[PDB]
Design a protein around this ligand. Structure first.
Ligand SMILES: *[C@@H]1O[C@H](CO)[C@@H](O)[C@H](O)[C@H]1NC(C)=O
Lengths: 49, 49
C-alpha cells in the first residue's frame, strides 16, 4: 500500500530587508550644527515631528 | 499667537490651475479625526458635478 510518511516543503531562499521611506526628511540636522548658540541661563527648544 | 506647541510646513495640496467655462463643479471631502493623540485625516477627491 501507500503510507503518508512525512512532508518535504521548500524553505525560503532568503529574506529581503528595506524600509518604505514613508513620513521622512528629518530637519533634525539643524540642531547641533548651527550659529548663535544661546547661553546657559537662556532656555531653548526645537520640537521635531 | 503665543503659547506654541508645534509648527509644520508643507506645500499647497489639492489645488490646480485649470481654465474652463461650463459645468465643471467639484466636491472635496476630508475626514477630520482625533485618535491616539493624532488628529488623523482621511480624504477622497471626487470631481463630480
Ligand atoms: C555640521 O558639521 C558636521 C561635521 O561634518 C556635518 O555633519 C554637517 O556639515 C553639519 N551637521 C549636520 C547635522 O548637518
Amino acid at each position: 500500500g501507500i503510507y503518508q510518511t512525512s512532508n518535504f516543503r521548500v524553505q525560503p531562499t532568503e529574506s529581503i530587508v528595506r524600509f518604505p521611506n514613508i513620513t521622512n526628511l528629518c530637519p533634525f540636522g539643524e540642531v547641533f550644527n548651527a550659529t548663535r548658540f544661546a547661553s546657559v541661563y537662556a532656555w531653548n527648544r526645537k520640537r521635531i515631528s | 499667537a503665543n503659547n506654541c506647541t508645534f509648527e509644520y510646513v508643507s506645500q499647497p495640496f489639492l489645488m490646480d490651475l485649470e481654465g474652463k467655462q461650463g459645468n465643471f463643479k467639484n466636491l472635496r471631502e476630508f475626514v477630520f479625526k482625533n485618535i491616539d493623540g493624532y488628529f488623523k485625516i482621511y480624504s477622497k477627491h471626487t470631481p463630480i458635478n
